[PDB]
């Protein structure tokens with residue numbers, strides 16, 4: 344069974360990595376690019392970008408541990424722990440050559456440690472729409488002069504007593520529509536049909552719980568990254584961020600400059616957090632062009 | 640049926656104010672003191688202070704509009720709108736002399752504008768455990784190195800789509816326990832019975848909604864307060880804050896110094912946000928002494 348429609352010419356498969364069965368969708372030929380989704384979503388956010396990339400690359404899009412059709416991690420949900428699964432997965436398909444990485448939202452949290460610890464394995468890097476976990480996150484406001492802030496949910500999701508699961512169970516579809524639209528500029532792309540697909544996936548009890556465990560591990564990931572960040576990333580990197588409602592704006596690039604020697608950033612006007620869906624045409628173009636500067 | 644037990648010598652009653660039927664509990668003799676509760680609670684949070692205060696004052700503790708047994712406001716939930724109801728209520732009982740005001744939590748939001756606009760009517764002022772709504776609240780962090788912050792609910796409650804009502808309905812008792820205890824140092828004071836009573840009250844559908852409408856009007860209250868604050872408060876003022884887990888610490892006094900010419904403050908070590916229940920004896924003492932420095936029975 345498949346929670347989301349696989350693009351024509353792609354395969355949906357699973358790979359056991361350190362005792363954890365990871366789901367992925369794969370297609371294309373050439374050097375490997377791994378695309379890693381974020382919260383509220385699955386590999387499917389990449390489905391419009393994938394066929395295009397697959398003309399020039401071998402493309403893999405896994406589900407994060409516990410999310411989509413992937414088993415929960417057995418170690419834990421901190422960025423360093425999860426990154427091990429993603430690194431080993433990628434290296435199964437690219438054992439003797441470096442691969443490209445594109446990551447959105449908590450996909451960043453879950454890949455940053457494997458990038459910094461295995462720099463020679465990463466040819467080119469694209470990060471969009473989430474802070475790398477560090478002390479900067481403790482500066483984001485709980486509340487703004489415009490109303491609900493960007494990251495108040497960090498505390499909601501991290502709260503003890505399974506507060507978030509207890510409140511959200513049974514109302515996953517309602518909550519996700521609010522969460523996604525509140526972080527979007529172009530809300531119109533989130534049709535009821537699309538929201539139904541995403542909500543059905545994260546409503547699996549283990550997936551709802553897994554989603555929040557990433558936030559419950561956030562302070563641990565910050566602590567991990569404080570050590571790792573002592574060495575800057577050396578490979579070509581690009582950041583994207585939305586400039587519209589719900590987007591990270593100039594923060595994405597400004598933070599990355601502290602982490603990378605070689606970085607170019609773009610802020611996409613009229614787009615919020617959900618770049619692949621809100622602004623598919625310019626986002627896809629930026630990613631393809633950036634990755635195509637290397638071998639393909 | 641009363642939602643909460645009335646202390647001996649007090650009466651539970653109602654007054655219409657601007658077309659809104661307000662509930663209050665009243666007792667004592669002497670100059671008036673009005674005690675205004677906050678979120679998650681009702682007049683009942685004052686039930687331990689009331690009998691002691693009633694020895695020297697006439698004491699009134701209303702339910703905020705939409706909460707407890709009070710009807711919703713007919714105008715709106717912004718601080719300036721809600722304060723009108725509280726001001727006019729107090730004036731019905733103290734038309735000829737100024738009265739004292741004690742407010743906790745969002746009681747502060749709902750009283751500040753009437754205090755600054757009718758300074759002649761306010762003899763002495765006590766504020767505890769809540770910021771006056773102003774730009775300072777936009778600085779509180781969403782998330783901390785220790786985890787769940789104390790202020791993330793500002794956004795949760797202010798959110799549209801009836802986000803909070805929709806998620807909390809059916810789980811009111813569970814949510815309230817988490818909210819109260821996560822802002823407490825002394826969680827033991829919140830018995831199953833006490834939480835049951837508070838949960839049942841705020842779970843009334845118009846009350847659950849009222850609770851969050853206070854937050855949906857918070858930015859408007861901030862905008863209102865920006866203009867009102869051009870005039871400093873001149874009455875004797877005391878701030879109280881908890882110094883333990885969940886408390887506001889030095890913020891209460893430090894914010895108030897920007898608003899008030901004549902202010903003294905205390906931070907209570909070992910106490911969190913819910914001062915009247917977590918730290919009833921010293922809070923009661925400080926309030927009683929501060930108010931008793933003025934004319935009383």
Ligand SMILES: CCC(=O)Nc1cc(Cl)c(Oc2ccc(O)c(-c3ccc(NC(N)=O)cc3)c2)c(Cl)c1
Nearest residue numbers: 382448449472473483492493494589590591594616
């Ligand atoms: C330097 C001063 C400063 O900090 N300004 C400032 C204020 C706010 Cl309120 C703010 O909030 C935002 C804005 C856009 C976002 O996409 C997000 C955002 C990003 C990622 C996730 N993903 C996840 N899984 O929760 C969720 C939300 C948050 C930012 Cl970035 C900066």
Ligand SMILES: CCC(=O)Nc1cc(Cl)c(Oc2ccc(O)c(-c3ccc(NC(N)=O)cc3)c2)c(Cl)c1
Nearest residue numbers: 678744745768769779780789790885886887890912
């Ligand atoms: C060290 C420098 C500094 O400025 N620290 C600092 C940080 C924060 Cl985050 C902060 O805000 C707080 C702290 C504790 C609280 O219980 C609350 C609080 C207050 C009122 C309600 N009530 C309602 N109904 O929502 C609920 C919670 C707010 C203050 Cl005042 C100071």
